[PDB]
């Protein structure tokens, strides 16, 4: 059927800059059935453009829609703070509605390196048969960060989970927490617990570690 | 104003049955087709089906054909999405959107209904401290936080009492564990000089299990 | 004949258990007994031999403009475009009138909604039905007047024996309005008024046409001195605005002009 | 009496939306125009717009046309000023006044609504001493707080004479800083104790720093 | 459009004296539309005069308004303590209400020289990566004062902020604080920190300095 492929996937630009988002269809499509939606984080989608070029009710003039056949484009002449969100293109055909995978519009800012912090499992937590080791990457930019867990110089796999904050309202940065989960048994078995952060703001991989004492 | 208001968040066990509503107001309900869109967590939008209030005609996405049924107003002025035996794979956000009468774009959207489906049961959280490092660069800044471990269902709310501490606080999005329970961390960067002088207490609130934890984060001795 | 088996409608002929199926005409109205659905009468929009037809809730084939999953389709009478059959959705474009109701069919062979410019005229098709708006109508925050033909009107319009004014964009204009160097006053419903009203500049007089003077109906007149209008007394200064509070004129007279309405409430005659 | 009473002080994050009110009493609300005047910190008066409640007609200053919208009473004799997405550049005092019905002066004014708009978050002040050397002067440096205000006092109350608490200055960091100083006799240094009491209700920070001569 | 230019910007007179404030319009204007407002410190503006000469409700007889065409005048026959404030004139307008930039009515008093004081960054503050150097100008008059920062005889620019108090209730004087903000890095880099005050009450520019000891 009809397949909508959007590019980039992420667009990092600064406020005031011009944004150009693409939507390519798997086959030639009617301009009448092409729409663009905006979705702020944790909010519902809202219509921006219908019929490929027509602007939905109460949609600012900076939002412009164009294209025909297979290639469609959403343009934001000047990015405002509110304009940083996800954009989905949509189409109708052969009795079904199809959506694009989205394009995030992220705030470009100067590279900022993470302040790294390691936290060992609490005594209360160790009483129960589980140990959780936490590696914190405070206010960094861009989102690209590699966090590796090393337990007595051995690289850990399939025993951690990372969680990222949304881009900060003040300094346009990200924070990340990677949690290593081990059974009290396997935790007592080793001494050196280390996380190795690899960010482009850092001259070389930064390692923040501890020993049980 | 033209608006579609949806029913509250749902937490149902697997195999159970559910009917979710979407109330239209500010417009002629019988004059517009109304559709259902699924947004799997952290993924995009999937069209499920559309319904015509003033014809009762329905059309479903071949991928949702049979798995769900769409219906409406039962007098005034609500649309419905229902399942006969839910799956954990049905845990997503469900939006109902009004359709324009040229050329099928969804012009008005509902706030959404979060439908969480798991075999798990309402468990409260275990709140552990993330104690400041004794190594933390003095004069400069240190980091401390809370480990809100093993809880169900979402959400938990973290503050640093009585709010007071807002600056440099980072409450992280919850991650669902393989255990079936959710977990998150709330951290804050403070000046290293404050450690010992200032008291740091995190206030974790989980209304589903009615848990109020106020854990003190002090450097370990 | 036509029989109801379980809320669904069917058709049978004399032989016995002779289900009919296909297009049948029961008097005036035509039905279609779906050979796919056990000979059940088709309701709503249904495809038969690649053609689209529409049936009401009672299974009878209908003609005209109807809401579809696609938008507003035209299920045309027979031979309306390229020898079509009765109720066949046709690949129609342009204006379409069906017993007063006016529609415009866009390039996609489907009915248009909202603002459409046709020839040099502006039309507003209902987002609910696709039908052109006629007479006074609220569209967003503003009010517009449309013809019996649905053409948007500009200038002065007489609606229910009252004068309204629609600017170069067709918007209704309320309050103190400048119309090509002349000033007029419209009520908040749009109706042009004669009398003294609260203008940004203050209280101003919008007078009836006087044979001398040469003022247009309801045109702001640069009045000065006392005005006696509609059993009310006003005094206007060189600002051509009415005065409030205490005012004594050399003619002896001491007046008190209401702070809210600028009308005389007290009049003491002196020397 | 004729009076316009406005809504309380607002501290908002940029991009948020705000609706500020102005309740009229003592007069016929629908017989008078009601206007909105902006006064930026340490600046003059700027007219924004007016509204006639009896007609619902509104007129704006070309400089505020589009950026804001004026509306009124749901029966309740109340005028409204609202923004859809605030800027830090909107941090100003907002006054509503009612217009006279000759010749457009604003005869009655509202107390005002302070609208503070920043990307910043509630941070408490840092207190540093401004130590004496060799009458003498000493003080306190109330640095990096948010939002306004902080209150400074000296020996709980006691010291009032010759105290100079300065107006806060907004730093490029988005946080405010100020100093509170006091001139005292040089003979008092060593005999008398000087403690400044800094209070910041928004972050609930109460510091008492002792200012003593450096050794 | 209509532009209201008020003169002077500051009128320094002593209590009991006669005050005459001017308002000149860019074009001939109606007397009906001319108004005068008073704004006391930390208070809302209040109407004094409407229709160029008419006195608003409860306004003392010392306040008198006059003028026509383009030149308008507010008069205060005898200045009371309360009368020291800002005065704005207003016009109309083609709807459009214009205001004047104001005239501050300051209390004239004898020239008084500032007592100058320099404060180095505290040890507590230096522990964190920032240094704040403070230059205090205690109880001076008039408001005209030049404060220059010099770090090892080099004149500083774009790294200080001055703050003035309102005219003192007791001695009608001003106080000023100019704060130099430097990173701990740049502060350790230099020895002599000086501020150079230039007031008309002083025999020559007064310099108050320190060295890190």
PDB file of C-alpha atoms in Angstrom, chain A:
ATOM      1  CA  UNK A   1       0.000   0.000   0.000  1.00  0.00           C
ATOM      2  CA  UNK A   2       0.883   3.748   0.438  1.00  0.00           C
ATOM      3  CA  UNK A   3       4.053   4.257   2.550  1.00  0.00           C
ATOM      4  CA  UNK A   4       5.117   7.645   3.915  1.00  0.00           C
ATOM      5  CA  UNK A   5       8.840   8.000   4.581  1.00  0.00           C
ATOM      6  CA  UNK A   6       9.896  11.254   6.326  1.00  0.00           C
ATOM      7  CA  UNK A   7      13.430  12.707   6.377  1.00  0.00           C
ATOM      8  CA  UNK A   8      15.533  13.566   8.441  1.00  0.00           C
ATOM      9  CA  UNK A   9      14.188  11.973  11.632  1.00  0.00           C
ATOM     10  CA  UNK A  10      15.848  14.726  13.701  1.00  0.00           C
ATOM     11  CA  UNK A  11      16.457  18.280  12.672  1.00  0.00           C
ATOM     12  CA  UNK A  12      18.664  20.312  14.999  1.00  0.00           C
ATOM     13  CA  UNK A  13      18.297  24.054  14.267  1.00  0.00           C
ATOM     14  CA  UNK A  14      18.365  27.201  16.437  1.00  0.00           C
ATOM     15  CA  UNK A  15      15.394  29.619  17.067  1.00  0.00           C
ATOM     16  CA  UNK A  16      14.847  32.093  14.172  1.00  0.00           C
ATOM     17  CA  UNK A  17      16.206  29.561  11.626  1.00  0.00           C
ATOM     18  CA  UNK A  18      14.299  28.128   8.632  1.00  0.00           C
ATOM     19  CA  UNK A  19      13.068  24.502   8.958  1.00  0.00           C
ATOM     20  CA  UNK A  20      12.388  22.247   5.953  1.00  0.00           C
ATOM     21  CA  UNK A  21      10.792  18.805   6.644  1.00  0.00           C
ATOM     22  CA  UNK A  22      10.337  16.136   3.932  1.00  0.00           C
ATOM     23  CA  UNK A  23       7.651  13.475   3.270  1.00  0.00           C
ATOM     24  CA  UNK A  24       8.196  11.041   0.402  1.00  0.00           C
ATOM     25  CA  UNK A  25       5.393   8.682  -0.696  1.00  0.00           C
ATOM     26  CA  UNK A  26       5.924   5.101  -1.969  1.00  0.00           C
ATOM     27  CA  UNK A  27       3.593   5.940  -4.918  1.00  0.00           C
ATOM     28  CA  UNK A  28       2.022   9.049  -6.572  1.00  0.00           C
ATOM     29  CA  UNK A  29      -0.625  10.567  -4.262  1.00  0.00           C
ATOM     30  CA  UNK A  30      -3.446  13.223  -4.333  1.00  0.00           C
ATOM     31  CA  UNK A  31      -2.519  16.632  -2.893  1.00  0.00           C
ATOM     32  CA  UNK A  32      -6.049  16.819  -1.428  1.00  0.00           C
ATOM     33  CA  UNK A  33      -5.324  13.924   0.942  1.00  0.00           C
ATOM     34  CA  UNK A  34      -1.948  15.198   2.220  1.00  0.00           C
ATOM     35  CA  UNK A  35      -1.856  16.571   5.780  1.00  0.00           C
ATOM     36  CA  UNK A  36       0.779  17.572   8.388  1.00  0.00           C
ATOM     37  CA  UNK A  37       0.371  17.286  12.185  1.00  0.00           C
ATOM     38  CA  UNK A  38       2.407  18.723  15.066  1.00  0.00           C
ATOM     39  CA  UNK A  39       2.772  16.878  18.365  1.00  0.00           C
ATOM     40  CA  UNK A  40       4.324  18.629  21.392  1.00  0.00           C
ATOM     41  CA  UNK A  41       5.795  16.097  23.972  1.00  0.00           C
ATOM     42  CA  UNK A  42       3.087  14.540  26.170  1.00  0.00           C
ATOM     43  CA  UNK A  43       0.334  16.355  24.199  1.00  0.00           C
ATOM     44  CA  UNK A  44      -2.164  15.358  21.472  1.00  0.00           C
ATOM     45  CA  UNK A  45      -1.413  15.822  17.718  1.00  0.00           C
ATOM     46  CA  UNK A  46      -2.851  18.955  16.058  1.00  0.00           C
ATOM     47  CA  UNK A  47      -3.521  19.643  12.354  1.00  0.00           C
ATOM     48  CA  UNK A  48      -1.191  22.206  10.720  1.00  0.00           C
ATOM     49  CA  UNK A  49      -1.691  21.709   6.950  1.00  0.00           C
ATOM     50  CA  UNK A  50      -4.462  19.999   4.980  1.00  0.00           C
ATOM     51  CA  UNK A  51      -4.762  19.479   1.206  1.00  0.00           C
ATOM     52  CA  UNK A  52      -0.910  19.705   0.972  1.00  0.00           C
ATOM     53  CA  UNK A  53      -0.743  23.577   1.043  1.00  0.00           C
ATOM     54  CA  UNK A  54      -3.837  24.815   3.000  1.00  0.00           C
ATOM     55  CA  UNK A  55      -3.246  25.975   6.510  1.00  0.00           C
ATOM     56  CA  UNK A  56      -5.571  24.640   9.301  1.00  0.00           C
ATOM     57  CA  UNK A  57      -7.540  27.097  11.521  1.00  0.00           C
ATOM     58  CA  UNK A  58      -5.366  29.297  13.793  1.00  0.00           C
ATOM     59  CA  UNK A  59      -2.083  28.081  12.311  1.00  0.00           C
ATOM     60  CA  UNK A  60       0.643  30.804  12.122  1.00  0.00           C
ATOM     61  CA  UNK A  61       1.839  32.085   8.685  1.00  0.00           C
ATOM     62  CA  UNK A  62       5.389  30.692   9.358  1.00  0.00           C
ATOM     63  CA  UNK A  63       3.930  27.225   8.649  1.00  0.00           C
ATOM     64  CA  UNK A  64       3.799  26.606   4.869  1.00  0.00           C
ATOM     65  CA  UNK A  65       3.016  23.369   3.001  1.00  0.00           C
ATOM     66  CA  UNK A  66       4.015  22.399  -0.574  1.00  0.00           C
ATOM     67  CA  UNK A  67       4.658  19.527  -2.962  1.00  0.00           C
ATOM     68  CA  UNK A  68       2.931  17.162  -5.447  1.00  0.00           C
ATOM     69  CA  UNK A  69       3.104  13.548  -6.694  1.00  0.00           C
ATOM     70  CA  UNK A  70       5.434  11.787  -4.215  1.00  0.00           C
ATOM     71  CA  UNK A  71       7.540  14.603  -2.666  1.00  0.00           C
ATOM     72  CA  UNK A  72       5.943  16.865  -0.018  1.00  0.00           C
ATOM     73  CA  UNK A  73       7.476  19.508   2.300  1.00  0.00           C
ATOM     74  CA  UNK A  74       6.565  21.335   5.479  1.00  0.00           C
ATOM     75  CA  UNK A  75       8.376  24.671   5.954  1.00  0.00           C
ATOM     76  CA  UNK A  76       8.761  26.825   9.111  1.00  0.00           C
ATOM     77  CA  UNK A  77      10.143  30.194   7.807  1.00  0.00           C
ATOM     78  CA  UNK A  78      11.356  31.245  11.359  1.00  0.00           C
ATOM     79  CA  UNK A  79      11.457  28.753  14.289  1.00  0.00           C
ATOM     80  CA  UNK A  80       9.869  29.994  17.532  1.00  0.00           C
ATOM     81  CA  UNK A  81      10.420  28.212  20.957  1.00  0.00           C
ATOM     82  CA  UNK A  82       6.970  26.546  20.708  1.00  0.00           C
ATOM     83  CA  UNK A  83       7.875  25.074  17.223  1.00  0.00           C
ATOM     84  CA  UNK A  84      10.241  22.420  18.633  1.00  0.00           C
ATOM     85  CA  UNK A  85       8.135  19.146  18.447  1.00  0.00           C
ATOM     86  CA  UNK A  86       7.373  16.023  16.308  1.00  0.00           C
ATOM     87  CA  UNK A  87       5.857  16.343  12.858  1.00  0.00           C
ATOM     88  CA  UNK A  88       3.884  13.606  11.141  1.00  0.00           C
ATOM     89  CA  UNK A  89       2.713  13.672   7.551  1.00  0.00           C
ATOM     90  CA  UNK A  90      -0.465  11.756   6.682  1.00  0.00           C
ATOM     91  CA  UNK A  91      -2.261  10.521   3.566  1.00  0.00           C
ATOM     92  CA  UNK A  92      -5.571   8.728   2.625  1.00  0.00           C
ATOM     93  CA  UNK A  93      -6.014   6.209  -0.188  1.00  0.00           C
ATOM     94  CA  UNK A  94      -7.658   2.830  -0.997  1.00  0.00           C
ATOM     95  CA  UNK A  95     -10.087   3.174   1.998  1.00  0.00           C
ATOM     96  CA  UNK A  96      -7.163   3.535   4.542  1.00  0.00           C
ATOM     97  CA  UNK A  97      -5.279   6.419   6.380  1.00  0.00           C
ATOM     98  CA  UNK A  98      -1.411   6.280   6.622  1.00  0.00           C
ATOM     99  CA  UNK A  99       1.023   8.284   8.809  1.00  0.00           C
ATOM    100  CA  UNK A 100       4.742   9.094   8.511  1.00  0.00           C
ATOM    101  CA  UNK A 101       7.171   7.956  11.218  1.00  0.00           C
ATOM    102  CA  UNK A 102       7.800  11.588  12.334  1.00  0.00           C
ATOM    103  CA  UNK A 103      10.636  14.158  12.318  1.00  0.00           C
ATOM    104  CA  UNK A 104      11.746  15.641  15.701  1.00  0.00           C
ATOM    105  CA  UNK A 105      12.725  19.336  15.624  1.00  0.00           C
ATOM    106  CA  UNK A 106      15.396  19.699  18.288  1.00  0.00           C
ATOM    107  CA  UNK A 107      17.079  22.961  19.500  1.00  0.00           C
ATOM    108  CA  UNK A 108      20.696  23.283  18.144  1.00  0.00           C
ATOM    109  CA  UNK A 109      23.004  24.669  20.849  1.00  0.00           C
ATOM    110  CA  UNK A 110      26.748  24.604  21.602  1.00  0.00           C
ATOM    111  CA  UNK A 111      28.281  21.258  22.500  1.00  0.00           C
ATOM    112  CA  UNK A 112      28.127  20.804  26.320  1.00  0.00           C
ATOM    113  CA  UNK A 113      29.845  17.897  28.052  1.00  0.00           C
ATOM    114  CA  UNK A 114      28.060  15.810  30.719  1.00  0.00           C
ATOM    115  CA  UNK A 115      28.938  16.085  34.428  1.00  0.00           C
ATOM    116  CA  UNK A 116      29.169  12.309  35.246  1.00  0.00           C
ATOM    117  CA  UNK A 117      28.114  10.816  38.678  1.00  0.00           C
ATOM    118  CA  UNK A 118      28.021   7.180  39.958  1.00  0.00           C
ATOM    119  CA  UNK A 119      25.775   5.966  42.842  1.00  0.00           C
ATOM    120  CA  UNK A 120      26.235   2.606  44.624  1.00  0.00           C
ATOM    121  CA  UNK A 121      23.263   0.444  45.868  1.00  0.00           C
ATOM    122  CA  UNK A 122      21.851   1.662  49.255  1.00  0.00           C
ATOM    123  CA  UNK A 123      22.142  -0.519  52.418  1.00  0.00           C
ATOM    124  CA  UNK A 124      18.261  -0.713  52.604  1.00  0.00           C
ATOM    125  CA  UNK A 125      18.179  -2.053  48.985  1.00  0.00           C
ATOM    126  CA  UNK A 126      20.998  -4.521  49.649  1.00  0.00           C
ATOM    127  CA  UNK A 127      18.942  -6.065  52.574  1.00  0.00           C
ATOM    128  CA  UNK A 128      16.505  -7.304  49.828  1.00  0.00           C
ATOM    129  CA  UNK A 129      18.277  -9.644  47.339  1.00  0.00           C
ATOM    130  CA  UNK A 130      18.916  -6.912  44.658  1.00  0.00           C
ATOM    131  CA  UNK A 131      21.591  -4.190  43.903  1.00  0.00           C
ATOM    132  CA  UNK A 132      20.978  -1.189  41.588  1.00  0.00           C
ATOM    133  CA  UNK A 133      24.008   0.868  40.457  1.00  0.00           C
ATOM    134  CA  UNK A 134      23.168   4.288  38.916  1.00  0.00           C
ATOM    135  CA  UNK A 135      25.281   6.320  36.409  1.00  0.00           C
ATOM    136  CA  UNK A 136      24.071  10.005  35.961  1.00  0.00           C
ATOM    137  CA  UNK A 137      25.032  12.208  32.878  1.00  0.00           C
ATOM    138  CA  UNK A 138      23.948  15.742  33.944  1.00  0.00           C
ATOM    139  CA  UNK A 139      22.986  18.535  31.461  1.00  0.00           C
ATOM    140  CA  UNK A 140      24.820  17.492  28.227  1.00  0.00           C
ATOM    141  CA  UNK A 141      24.329  18.228  24.439  1.00  0.00           C
ATOM    142  CA  UNK A 142      23.876  16.631  21.782  1.00  0.00           C
ATOM    143  CA  UNK A 143      21.754  13.581  22.938  1.00  0.00           C
ATOM    144  CA  UNK A 144      24.415  11.117  21.518  1.00  0.00           C
ATOM    145  CA  UNK A 145      26.101   9.483  24.537  1.00  0.00           C
ATOM    146  CA  UNK A 146      27.573   5.927  25.043  1.00  0.00           C
ATOM    147  CA  UNK A 147      27.417   4.597  28.641  1.00  0.00           C
ATOM    148  CA  UNK A 148      29.287   1.377  29.251  1.00  0.00           C
ATOM    149  CA  UNK A 149      29.191  -0.602  32.539  1.00  0.00           C
ATOM    150  CA  UNK A 150      32.417  -2.314  33.718  1.00  0.00           C
ATOM    151  CA  UNK A 151      32.459  -4.652  36.766  1.00  0.00           C
ATOM    152  CA  UNK A 152      36.105  -5.434  37.715  1.00  0.00           C
ATOM    153  CA  UNK A 153      37.208  -4.334  34.136  1.00  0.00           C
ATOM    154  CA  UNK A 154      34.587  -6.707  32.484  1.00  0.00           C
ATOM    155  CA  UNK A 155      32.104  -5.006  30.039  1.00  0.00           C
ATOM    156  CA  UNK A 156      28.457  -5.600  31.068  1.00  0.00           C
ATOM    157  CA  UNK A 157      25.675  -6.451  28.559  1.00  0.00           C
ATOM    158  CA  UNK A 158      21.867  -6.922  28.865  1.00  0.00           C
ATOM    159  CA  UNK A 159      21.659  -5.818  32.520  1.00  0.00           C
ATOM    160  CA  UNK A 160      21.151  -2.013  32.265  1.00  0.00           C
ATOM    161  CA  UNK A 161      18.436   0.467  31.207  1.00  0.00           C
ATOM    162  CA  UNK A 162      18.887   4.131  30.177  1.00  0.00           C
ATOM    163  CA  UNK A 163      16.286   6.972  30.549  1.00  0.00           C
ATOM    164  CA  UNK A 164      16.589  10.445  28.905  1.00  0.00           C
ATOM    165  CA  UNK A 165      14.921  13.688  29.931  1.00  0.00           C
ATOM    166  CA  UNK A 166      13.301  16.004  27.385  1.00  0.00           C
ATOM    167  CA  UNK A 167      15.452  18.961  26.103  1.00  0.00           C
ATOM    168  CA  UNK A 168      15.688  21.460  29.023  1.00  0.00           C
ATOM    169  CA  UNK A 169      13.529  24.628  28.829  1.00  0.00           C
ATOM    170  CA  UNK A 170      16.417  26.834  30.151  1.00  0.00           C
ATOM    171  CA  UNK A 171      19.735  25.512  28.694  1.00  0.00           C
ATOM    172  CA  UNK A 172      18.453  23.156  25.876  1.00  0.00           C
ATOM    173  CA  UNK A 173      20.329  20.179  27.373  1.00  0.00           C
ATOM    174  CA  UNK A 174      19.641  16.481  28.080  1.00  0.00           C
ATOM    175  CA  UNK A 175      20.181  14.384  31.181  1.00  0.00           C
ATOM    176  CA  UNK A 176      20.501  10.557  31.172  1.00  0.00           C
ATOM    177  CA  UNK A 177      20.420   7.865  33.894  1.00  0.00           C
ATOM    178  CA  UNK A 178      21.752   4.335  33.091  1.00  0.00           C
ATOM    179  CA  UNK A 179      20.784   1.789  35.808  1.00  0.00           C
ATOM    180  CA  UNK A 180      22.778  -1.479  36.307  1.00  0.00           C
ATOM    181  CA  UNK A 181      20.649  -4.168  38.033  1.00  0.00           C
ATOM    182  CA  UNK A 182      22.346  -7.126  39.727  1.00  0.00           C
ATOM    183  CA  UNK A 183      21.316  -9.753  42.320  1.00  0.00           C
ATOM    184  CA  UNK A 184      22.874  -9.186  45.865  1.00  0.00           C
ATOM    185  CA  UNK A 185      24.779 -12.496  45.152  1.00  0.00           C
ATOM    186  CA  UNK A 186      26.595 -11.233  41.965  1.00  0.00           C
ATOM    187  CA  UNK A 187      27.116  -7.752  43.484  1.00  0.00           C
ATOM    188  CA  UNK A 188      29.074  -9.169  46.570  1.00  0.00           C
ATOM    189  CA  UNK A 189      31.183 -11.287  44.057  1.00  0.00           C
ATOM    190  CA  UNK A 190      33.053  -8.140  42.689  1.00  0.00           C
ATOM    191  CA  UNK A 191      34.895  -4.931  43.908  1.00  0.00           C
ATOM    192  CA  UNK A 192      35.270  -2.195  41.164  1.00  0.00           C
ATOM    193  CA  UNK A 193      32.041  -0.821  39.651  1.00  0.00           C
ATOM    194  CA  UNK A 194      32.562   1.688  36.828  1.00  0.00           C
ATOM    195  CA  UNK A 195      30.633   3.521  34.116  1.00  0.00           C
ATOM    196  CA  UNK A 196      32.471   4.810  31.010  1.00  0.00           C
ATOM    197  CA  UNK A 197      30.762   7.855  29.290  1.00  0.00           C
ATOM    198  CA  UNK A 198      31.657   8.659  25.604  1.00  0.00           C
ATOM    199  CA  UNK A 199      30.337  12.146  24.609  1.00  0.00           C
ATOM    200  CA  UNK A 200      31.673  14.542  21.893  1.00  0.00           C
ATOM    201  CA  UNK A 201      32.062  17.288  24.539  1.00  0.00           C
ATOM    202  CA  UNK A 202      34.670  15.140  26.348  1.00  0.00           C
ATOM    203  CA  UNK A 203      38.355  14.934  25.170  1.00  0.00           C
ATOM    204  CA  UNK A 204      38.389  11.134  25.876  1.00  0.00           C
ATOM    205  CA  UNK A 205      36.006   8.611  27.611  1.00  0.00           C
ATOM    206  CA  UNK A 206      35.311   9.702  31.215  1.00  0.00           C
ATOM    207  CA  UNK A 207      35.150   6.924  33.849  1.00  0.00           C
ATOM    208  CA  UNK A 208      33.395   7.491  37.248  1.00  0.00           C
ATOM    209  CA  UNK A 209      33.855   4.458  39.612  1.00  0.00           C
ATOM    210  CA  UNK A 210      33.617   3.020  43.177  1.00  0.00           C
ATOM    211  CA  UNK A 211      34.815   0.095  45.340  1.00  0.00           C
ATOM    212  CA  UNK A 212      32.659  -1.320  48.195  1.00  0.00           C
ATOM    213  CA  UNK A 213      33.987   0.868  51.108  1.00  0.00           C
TER     214      UNK A 213
END
